[PDB]
Design a protein around this ligand. Structure first.
Ligand code: SSA
Ligand code: SSA
Ligand code: ZN
Ligand code: ZN
Lengths: 401, 401
């Protein structure tokens, strides 16, 4: 179930020598990416997050202030313009603080949950690159929550609940959690680390999550909870993550007026639920072996005619399903129906509707699935409603199975 | 009228010295950006385009092959990794050709219309930067159409129709068209340029579009039909564009198998309809003076109480409108009704619903608009249906106006 092989076979993406670790998302792969964005956004609305977009690069000076230059320089790409040096962003946090810093903030504005599908670039050693799992350019379903110390418990718990909420949709049987503590190179005092590490351990236990410590693997700015998912060879990949930061906001001069009218520095919680779209799609591709649940399938339905006699009917049905919000395509090629069915089956299209004369006269469609199940003739409106239900619910199972 | 002043007043975005010409999109500005993407995607579906995503950077060698290095070096940002040099993409075309080159192509695959909301970076002189109109980092609603020479007429015509189609949604009364001819520094033969320039001129005539030539302003790879829109000072800004390229495909070894079964090089049409999301939003902001059509308004409705007596009712209606897909906010502050209305009018919020005792008892709301009008009390469900229609149809006018 190598996602690199499935990606090629289903025409999802490709990579080349001229752009090591850089993904070229083909139409079908990009459709999956976009559907995941829709899913995340639905949750961003439910869990009350703003959504922003920061710049691709910022002056080296800013990255020096955050501690990224001294603790993360080897992973950063740099460029220049008019005698000034810039770092292509490896993280979205600094840009979020810049947005937070615009306009006076009050305790009444906290917690302020700021999300972004942020494109990050990291100069990963070429020898460590691996398909979609470890790339140099990726998009994180990132967010930074600015809050008070008293709000930490509730906000971290909210992030944890969001992870299991979203992961439940995919039916992940194996989710391993780790708590990564203070690394050798770090910012912040030992006292701050004691408190932050304790806050995350308490959160994990209060949520009934068994976890193991991963000494010295925390971020330079804070400890981190790692939600590990596994590929087909059972290799561990860090996907979701929650990090507790008491240092970056201060370094970037973030503050708010407290209920006491005094200037305070907000705590910042960093979290990514899927991790990166690239890595998450890599995990899903191997988990489903290419049989993506209908709500995620690049093409959900393909309608085929037996002969030119049913072409008009097929076009009408295709427009009807399309107007119903289904990703559907008509296959009116001059090929044998058995040839068309095999092609789409190999592409793992969830449903294939075949239209012969009896279907046209009947106003029905012959339905079969990529698994080879023959559902027989069904009423068009019946199939539309069943499909909409499967899609809307993001069900892992297809009609009857 | 200035979009920079309006952008500040409505908290849409900000820019700062650590990232010259790089936009920080705040929640509200990003909401407009996203609605435009949704709008564009609805047209991509209607006009039959695929949507992809290419990498942010590629090896300098690739840019040397396309002619970008010799003819566009000054506008490109470069970076490196492991003794290799890369150029941050200033255009999406090369990446699209790389995607096209994956897998054998046949004449049956053409025309192949490939779109992308492509993030481009160009090292524009700092002195030329201007708000959202001329930036260093922007997103183009780009696309490249691969086709046969015989399909050029229809594909160019389709792009031209797409431009007026999309622009009509915004009600632009001033769209100026120019045909930009061969620049001093260019690739390709005189014969190729005469042919491409003539093809575009004929397409304009066929559509009865009056235009003027703009000498030497075409791209180094081909001539361009330029659609200019104007700002509050009546300054021209290039937005939509359609370009004919007989050079890039060949330089990047693109080809397809024709009906005769022989290797052919595809023609490529480049086109952006809005131009860049940044520049288009700048144009819209000034065109509407901040009075964004309801479908684009960051906040579409604000519901307010008179006294705490109506607070629960306001909260109920807010959730109700939110569930109906409307961008709504509640204003429960202890301020006079006039005070609240003046504030949200300055924020250009389309509708303000006032809830007094009468409203709470009758299950209605008193409607006021940002244009200083009083629409009287209306039934809540009727308001929702009407707003949904105004949004769904992307109407330029509010209720009864
Ligand atoms: N090289 C990479 N390739 C693919 N995905 C990556 C790569 N590096 C990081 N990620 C993903 O991005 C997630 C978040 O990255 S992180 O460095 O752990 N944390 C962040 O950067 C924090 N700034 C998030 O707010 C990771 O959990 C992982 O899933
Ligand atoms: N510096 C800039 N700031 C904002 N928008 C820009 C900038 N440069 C270009 N654009 C927008 O991007 C559009 C397309 O750019 S272009 O160079 O004319 N053409 C392209 O790059 C072609 N490769 C499109 O396929 C322009 O019409 C303009 O609206
Ligand atoms: Zn972060
Ligand atoms: Zn182009």
């Amino acid at each position: 179930r190598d996602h690199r092989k499935i990606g090629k076979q289903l025409d999802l993406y490709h990579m080349q020598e001229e752009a090591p670790g850089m993904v070229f998302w083909h139409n079908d792969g990009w459709t999956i990416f976009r559907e995941l964005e829709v899913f995340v956004r639905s949750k961003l609305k439910e869990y009350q997050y703003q959504e922003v977009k920061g710049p691709f690069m910022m002056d080296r000076v800013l990255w020096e202030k955050t501690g990224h230059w001294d603790n993360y320089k080897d992973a950063m790409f740099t460029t220049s313009s008019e005698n000034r040096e810039y770092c292509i962003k490896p993280m979205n946090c600094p840009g979020h603080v810049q947005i937070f810093n615009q306009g006076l903030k009050s305790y009444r504005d906290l917690p302020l949950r700021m999300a972004e599908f942020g494109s990050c670039h990291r100069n990963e050693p070429s020898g460590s690159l691996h398909g979609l799992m470890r790339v140099r350019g990726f998009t994180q379903d990132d967010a930074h929550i600015f809050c008070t110390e008293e709000q930490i418990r509730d906000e971290v718990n909210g992030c944890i609940r969001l992870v299991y909420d979203m992961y439940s949709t995919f039916g992940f049987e194996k989710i391993v959690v780790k708590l990564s503590t203070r690394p050798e190179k770090r910012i912040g005092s030992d006292e701050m680390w004691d408190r932050a590490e304790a806050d995350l351990a308490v959160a994990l236990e209060e949520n009934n999550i068994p976890f193991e410590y991963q000494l010295g693997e925390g971020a330079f700015y804070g400890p981190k909870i790692e939600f590990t998912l596994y590929d087909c060879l059972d290799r561990a990949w860090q996907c979701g993550t929650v990090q507790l930061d008491f240092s970056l906001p201060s370094r970037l001069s973030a503050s708010y007026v407290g209920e006491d009218n005094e200037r305070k520095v907000p705590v910042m919680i960093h979290r990514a639920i899927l991790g990166s779209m690239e890595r998450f799609i890599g995990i899903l591709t191997e988990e489903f072996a290419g049989f993506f649940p209908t709500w995620l399938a690049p093409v959900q339905v393909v309608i085929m005619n037996i002969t030119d006699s049913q072409s008009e009917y097929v076009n009408e049905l295709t427009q009807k399903l399309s107007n119903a919000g289904i990703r559907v395509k008509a296959d009116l090629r001059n090929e044998k129906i058995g040839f068309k069915i095999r092609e789409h089956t190999l592409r793992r299209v969830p449903y294939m509707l075949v239209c012969g004369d009896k279907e046209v006269e009947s106003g029905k469609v012959a339905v079969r699935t990529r698994r080879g199940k023959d559902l027989g003739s069904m009423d068009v409106n019946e199939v539309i409603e069943k499909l909409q239900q499967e899609i809307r619910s993001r069900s892992l199972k297809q009609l009857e199975e």
